[PDB]
Ligand SMILES: COc1ccc(-c2ccc(S(=O)(=O)N[C@H](C(C)C)P(=O)(O)O)cc2)cc1
Ligand SMILES: [Ca+2]
C-alpha cells in the first residue's frame with residue numbers, strides 16, 4: 299500500500315495549484331473535482347490542502363497532451379490516464395492528466411474527481427492496492443461520486459504514512 303522508499307511529505311500543510319484546465323468541464327467543476335479529491339485524503343489524515351494560483355505550490359496539477367517535458371508522455375484516449383510524482387521538491391508530488399481523455403464529473407469515463415483523488419494518493423506517497431474497491435487500485439473503475447469518501451484500504455494507507 300506504500301510506495302517503495304517510503305517517500306512522504308515532511309510537512310502536513312500542503313499547497314496545490316491548478317496550472318491549467320481541461321475545456322471539457324467548467325473551471326469551477328475542475329476546481330471542485332480537485333478540491334474534493336484532496337479533501338478525501340485530508341479528512342483521514344493530518345494533511346491540510348490549500349489552493350494557490352500564483353507562486354510555487356507543493357502539488358502542481360496540469361492537463362497535458364503527449365510529450366510534456368518530463369519524459370513520460372501521455373498517449374491519447376485511454377491507456378495512460380494520468381500520473382503523479384512521489385513526495386519531494388520540484389516535480390515531486392505533481393499530478394498530470396492526459397488532456398486527450400474525456401474528463402467528466404459523471405459516470406462516463408473518466409471521472410476527474412476519481413482519477414485526481416487516485417493520483418493524489420501517489421502524490422502523497424501511496425502505492426497501488428490489491429483491493430479492487432480501493433481508490434488506489436491500479437485500474438480505473440467508476441464508483442458513485444456524489445457522497446464518495448476514502449475507501450477503508452486507502453484510509454489505512456494514508457494513516458500508515460501520516461497518522
Ligand atoms: C477508484 O478510483 C480510481 C482507480 C484507479 C485510477 C487509475 C489512474 C491512472 C491509471 S494509469 O494511467 O493507467 N497508470 C499510471 C502510471 C502509468 C504512471 P498510475 O496509476 O501509477 O498513476 C490507471 C487507473 C483512477 C481512479
Ligand atoms: Ca491516455
Ligand SMILES: [Ca+2]
Nearest residue numbers: 356388389390
Ligand atoms: Ca511539486
Ligand SMILES: [Zn+2]
Nearest residue numbers: 366368370394
Ligand atoms: Zn507528466
Ligand SMILES: [Zn+2]
Nearest residue numbers: 416420426436
Ligand atoms: Zn495509480
